[PDB]
């Protein structure tokens with residue numbers, strides 16, 4: 017199924033019938049960072065498997081729902097269970113849910129992920145406002161836009177210079193200052209490792225040389241599809257380890273440690289993003 | 299359809315029947331840089347769609363013809379409408395037209411493209427003679443030769459050390475000196491970004507660190523197929539912007555600006571390449 | 581055919597019926613470096629084409645056998661004819677033979693390859709004990725684990741920090757010292773170039789900047805599958821040229837020169853690995 021205008025329209029039609037909500041904000045939350053979705057008010061939960069043309073996700077299993085409702089007086093749509101390219105999903109499968117958001121009315125997309133720290137200033141538990149990226153899959157002919165261009169959504173050759181909105185970054189920092197946790201908030205450049213192996217010690221050393229501050233396995237595909245069709249983006253990484261320190265000290269990286277960091281910061285991240293949604297410009 | 303000896307032979311048979319021309323020079327021209335093809339003498343235009351085993355190009359649309367005839371007394375074959383890998387074409391689809399050129403008798407291939415400047419010496423409107431490359435798709439298991447080797451055309455493991463012929467570079471510079479535009483002509487290393495997003499500001503900064511002078515989304519696949527089967531190459535980039543300056547000044551990159559640069563240099567590039575063809579060794 | 585638990589079990593069942601050997605050591609030997617396999621004692625040769633669910637290898641041709649037997653009193657299984665990803669094999673085809681080794685009882689995998697030297701200390705004929713890697717295909721969404729995770733074999737997100745066992749490296753060096761060829765033995769970081777073109781002169785210069793000591797087109801996919809399912813690895817490169825010197829002196833790289841180096845070191849490498857197998861811990 018191609019992520020074209022006709023197919024995205026059919027999915028949006030189903031959703032609008034079922035939900036009644038016209039959202040102008042979208043959210044995609046990282047693993048262990050989805051509590052906010054359970055607090056959406058007057059909400060409607062739509063399993064992906066029920067929506068025409070949505071990608072099949074049963075081989076991976078686990079949760080996969082679209083959730084619509086209200087937060088802070090604002091109308092939002094959330095993806096509960098994101099699609100990652102290391103699972104084998106195609107370019108068309110990743111892109112279709114974001115293009116459906118566009119047809120539903122989304123103008124701003126907020127994204128969180130868990131990532132490894134490269135910059136020596138980063139500790140476990142810190143947050144990084146993403147200000148740019150290095151897309152190794154894109155340089156290597158696995159960009160999410162490889163294929164025919166869908167002209168109704170955007171141009172053949174997108175410019176990513178303003179993919180990460182500066183005013184949204186400034187609003188997120190302002191709110192952290194108001195609640196006295198700005199000492200946790202950094203900015204930086206995100207390297208996309210296709211994955212699913214964690215970056216090796218020598219890959220981490222290479223990324224430090226190349227100007228990367230953070231490394232992870234998600235987010236860049238969604239950012240590019242959003243930028244192509246004119247949706248503004250704020251993306252925030254939660255740092256689970258510093259891979260450069262771990263390489264110097266021969267310390268292991270593992271998913272169990274990652275999820276414990278997520279639990280430690282989940283409630284603060286939920287409160288932060290609730291306020292961001294409330295404060296977004298009108 | 300595999301780009302093998304049998305399938306390329308069937309395409310060449312069709313062409314030879316229709317055209318009568320036995321070319322020993324091939325040309326592939328960049329977008330907005332194809333005026334020379336309209337001035338081929340005693341010419342024959344063959345739509346790709348008519349040629350056995352040529353790749354299907356109707357999803358992308360736009361022009362796609364093989365043109366045979368004479369320039370400056372020399373017999374040439376031109377591709378009018380090149381195939382780019384960011385459109386989703388396979389390794390076999392890119393390679394088959396170059397291997398057909400080989401069977402038709404081509405010994406020299408001249409290639410132009412539009413590209414972004416990385417080296418701080420490069421301005422919009424400059425030309426770069428390509429002397430080497432950094433192939434990010436090739437390092438990342440998307441090389442144009444991934445697949446079974448077609449032994450009749452070349453070896454399993456090609457050496458690219460002499461892919462860009464030095465004497466052809468020297469002849470191109472000599473002609474620029476004769477016509478007093480050598481101040482526009484540089485040499486440099488080309489980075490292949492699979493695309494179709496332009497290089498991000500942080501990718502541009504990375505390429506500067508890694509010794510790249512220019513970045514673009516074409517040319518390297520054709521160069522590798524030509525080198526594999528023993529065809530000499532001259533490749534020239536027309537610079538449309540300096541991405542490092544644009545990153546420092548927060549200035550946007552876009553296809554409209556690119557095509558205006560192409561129009562500004564099209565007639566000079568046509569005259570230059572006409573003389574190169576005329577002067578090629580016998 | 582997916583490299584899952586059911587399919588690997590069916591292959592292992594065939595093998596166990598035919599061979600009687602329960603191996604706890606596996607070997608994968610580089611091209612021209614396979615003489616040891618001909619000296620396996622009380623051996624059984626099983627063509628890949630006869631084994632249920634093994635990948636089809638007839639397009640590439642050439643030898644493809646599993647060989648079981650004894651070396652130095654130890655029970656081993658060897659792959660005679662390795663699968664390389666530049667031939668077009670899928671992730672599932674590369675992984676299935678290593679997962680079969682796991683089900684057969686393999687706890688240690690010894691691997692050799694031929695490679696190019698980047699570090700200026702490396703000469704043709706030197707050996708490099710691999711201590712880490714830079715996986716360009718993995719960064720670029722062509723990692724061998726892209727796809728659904730096979731949970732019975734290992735975790736969704738493997739850590740590669742200890743992929744190259746330190747004690748095995750120390751044993752290999754100890755044996756070289758006992759036989760007075762330690763002056764040939766280095767350690768270093770391996771860059772995986774998907775291939776099949778040799779690294780270009782400018783790619784070689786880039787790899788030097790990024791901390792790579794050696795570059796080649798194999799080994800990293802097998803190492804990752806082995807690490808995922810808990811098999812210890814020793815990997816050794818035989819250096820056929822120094823690509824940085826060749827770039828400075830405009831000297832060519834070619835498969836014929838490579839195989840002559842292999843012949844020069846084959847008998848010493850055979851003796852070295854025979855002793856390593858004999859000395860492996862119990």
Ligand SMILES: Cc1cc(Cl)nc(N)n1
Nearest residue numbers: 130131132232233256274
């Ligand atoms: C949570 C996480 C993700 C990634 Cl890709 N890398 C690290 N080191 N940590």
Ligand SMILES: Cc1cc(Cl)nc(N)n1
Nearest residue numbers: 412413414514515538556
């Ligand atoms: C014309 C062009 C092509 C490319 Cl790939 N990049 C830039 N900056 N400009």
Ligand SMILES: Cc1cc(Cl)nc(N)n1
Nearest residue numbers: 694695696796797820838
């Ligand atoms: C034997 C070999 C392999 C590779 Cl990938 N590169 C070089 N220079 N040499």
